[PDB]
Symmetry: C3
């Protein structure tokens, strides 16, 4: 063993070992524990290449305790001319035909979070796609609004419909008969005893078609 009381600088560091090759611990209010930087401006060089051959353990663990930031924060620095149309911030490949591996898995093992499970926020003023902690889904709703149904879709822009279905729509019997409609007016379409019914905004209930 060799102990340097100060910093070491070198052209390169390498270890091929049965010990843990690196343990880098920093305690500071200003310094990161590690910076890895690829300054090349072309070629086949990444900043960081991580590989595991061990099937019994995650190739990589990341744990944080942030109050107002992402545990992993990924920035893609794009191009004003749109020459990055084939790039992504995050790309996942599930390789090997026959695999049953999942793509993205999100849970909360001590109990449900009160925060959004996913929030895609590209267009100003909107939640393009959001799944709330409650499980309700918004599609084009006002940003940070509470969805007013299990799934809430708003027709935006020059879209000609809120919803297109190329196929049939099954509607199960409602467990509770509606007594109201949405604040956007219109009405409530539901099944009751196998029949199709509409409650309109003025409170008229019509059986449209029988069981």
């Amino acid at each position: 063993t060799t102990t340097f009381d100060g910093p070491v600088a070198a052209e390169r560091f390498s270890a091929d070992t049965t010990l843990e090759a690196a343990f880098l611990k920093t305690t500071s209010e200003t310094n990161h524990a590690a910076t890895i930087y690829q300054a090349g401006t072309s070629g086949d060089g990444a900043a960081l290449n991580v590989i595991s051959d061990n099937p019994g353990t995650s190739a990589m663990y990341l744990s944080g305790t942030e109050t107002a930031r992402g545990t992993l924060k990924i920035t893609h620095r794009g191009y004003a001319d749109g020459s990055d149309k084939d790039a992504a911030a995050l790309s996942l490949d599930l390789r090997v035909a026959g695999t049953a591996a999942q793509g993205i898995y999100v849970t909360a093992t001590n109990g449900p979070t009160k925060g959004n499970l996913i929030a895609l926020r590209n267009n100003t003023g909107l939640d393009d796609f959001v799944v709330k902690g409650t499980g309700r889904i918004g599609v084009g709703i006002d940003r940070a609004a509470t969805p007013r149904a299990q799934v809430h879709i708003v027709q935006r822009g020059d879209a000609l419909a809120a919803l297109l279905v190329e196929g049939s729509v099954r509607i199960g019997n409602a467990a509770t008969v509606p007594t109201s409609v949405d604040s956007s007016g219109g009405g409530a379409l539901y099944a009751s005893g196998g029949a199709l019914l509409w409650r309109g905004s003025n409170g008229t209930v019509t059986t449209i078609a029988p069981a």
Copy 2:
């Protein structure tokens, strides 16, 4: 070149080079290859800061061969008082106006996986949002259940509707006329020859409105 036959300890390691700055290889059944740890409890210090200026290659590659874990596993250690409402496990920023970069891209280049493409599982007993390997989507279905349509939504909790649409609903002609309904009863709404039809649970088929 300098070869240490044993471990090296130092106050800091730095390299500014044209070689690969670090190669850390471990072969073990108990040791990780590398641990990076920020022990600070406040300030602007991260554990790991990775940057690339090379547009021709991913800033970071991660490859694993896990049988029952995530290739990247991210844990956010939260707070019982909800003081982490602005935090996230994963945060992506697509910067530079004019960019055409994508957010999240998932595929399976050797053939389709049999596992879930995404599974958001916050609430006990439920799949809040799941996209199966088949492409079917569940919203509030029982956890791990097979969706019973291309998209299957269940009205949960105190939601007043399964689906709210602020706009019109287009229904294309069904390629195959329904001959059955869902196990939750109710019926099947479909278009046929431009007309709107309902099949009820007792098998009655009604043309509600003409083409």
Copy 3:
């Protein structure tokens, strides 16, 4: 301080410090800046283990400027026998009961991207689930096609319906009355003045049920 003019090799590198423990900078068109490799084929060893105790800063930052690749690229090397049914490429755990932390957050802080916010592409020829830069959503649409509504669902495979709703469907009044239908034929279902209406493919408009 100690300066090595050449490469250093050792059995292990460790630092427990108040400085940044590691700064690894490479400028090259062929070399990565760092490779971390777990060559073990069993056990509890990961390649990389990253931990932060600092709540004021992301545990990990990643920044890239790719034109045609992912900033973070994750590959899971699977198994032909499906013995990886419990594995995932990305796994997120929001821990601590009471937490309000979010799962996945995606935005574009300089203005909207023109690329897909999320694209799940498992089945050949299809977009299983895609959210376009515009916010439109496709479910089973042809891969890379533009959705023809805010949400566009296609009944695929042996699914018996495009959409199943176990609950009621609220339809708000349409801000603009439809004057056309989809290219898949059928018609347009909408609310108008609290009433339910259908426009069929031949242009007939029927009030199905009153407000």
